[PDB]
Amino acid sequence: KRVLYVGGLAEEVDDKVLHAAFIPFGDITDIQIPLDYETEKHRGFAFVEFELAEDAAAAIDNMNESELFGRTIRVNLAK
RNA sequence: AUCGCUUCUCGGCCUUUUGGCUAAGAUCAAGUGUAGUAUCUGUUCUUAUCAUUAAUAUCGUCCUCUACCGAGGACAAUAUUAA
């Protein structure tokens, strides 16, 4: 319950932006962003893994439907 | 009384049906064996079909485009809560 799906990411968003946006909720152990090597850009989503499930939970509550780089993002348990 | 439907009864067609001939064309009794096949009689096991819900989000195959890779679409159940 530590891994979150994060969608609706603008092109300018990268692993650094994600780390900065989610670290306020707790320490993070991993951030994965699937890439399209033909374009070299991400596909609009990523997975953020928190150290603690309780922190992942607080992040879902405060970040789902929040704004990042001008647009609304979607956040929920990945699985 | 008339029209339509249904049940029952009955008449008509029913050669639609017996498609040649001769010396009725001729003739006229029975088990011997086996194995093999078929039928019947019992000996044995018949009563029923089996297995939570609500809400939210999203590896394999097929098609298309671009240069094995990437993107998009569709299909195949998954997760959480509560008795």
From Swiss-Prot:
Expression across tissues: Found in all the examined tissues including heart, brain, placenta, lung, liver, skeletal muscle, kidney and pancreas.
Disulfides per UniProt: none
Source superkingdom: Eukaryota
Effect listed in the UniProt record for changing residue 47 to D: Abolishes interaction with KMT2A. Abolishes inhibition of KMT2A activity
Subcellular location: Nucleus
Phenotypic consequence of residue 38 to A: Slightly decreased affinity for KMT2A
Domain RRM: 2-79
Subunit structure: Identified in the spliceosome C complex. Component of the XAB2 complex, a multimeric protein complex composed of XAB2, PRPF19, AQR, ZNF830, ISY1, and PPIE. Identified in a pentameric intron-binding (IB) complex composed of AQR, XAB2, ISY1, ZNF830 and PPIE that is incorporated into the spliceosome as a preassembled complex. The IB complex does not contain PRPF19. Interacts (via RNA-binding domain) with KMT2A (via the third PHD-type zinc-finger).
Protein family: Belongs to the cyclophilin-type PPIase family. PPIase E subfamily.
Comment, domains: The RRM domain mediates both interaction with RNA and with KMT2A (via the third PHD-type zinc-finger), but has much higher affinity for the KMT2A PHD-type zinc-finger.
Role this protein plays: Involved in pre-mRNA splicing as component of the spliceosome. Combines RNA-binding and PPIase activities. Binds mRNA and has a preference for single-stranded RNA molecules with poly-A and poly-U stretches, suggesting it binds to the poly(A)-region in the 3'-UTR of mRNA molecules. Catalyzes the cis-trans isomerization of proline imidic peptide bonds in proteins. Inhibits KMT2A activity; this requires proline isomerase activity.
Listed name of the protein: Peptidyl-prolyl cis-trans isomerase E
Organism from which the protein derives: Homo sapiens
Source lineage: Eukaryota, Metazoa, Chordata, Craniata, Vertebrata
Gene this protein is translated from: PPIE
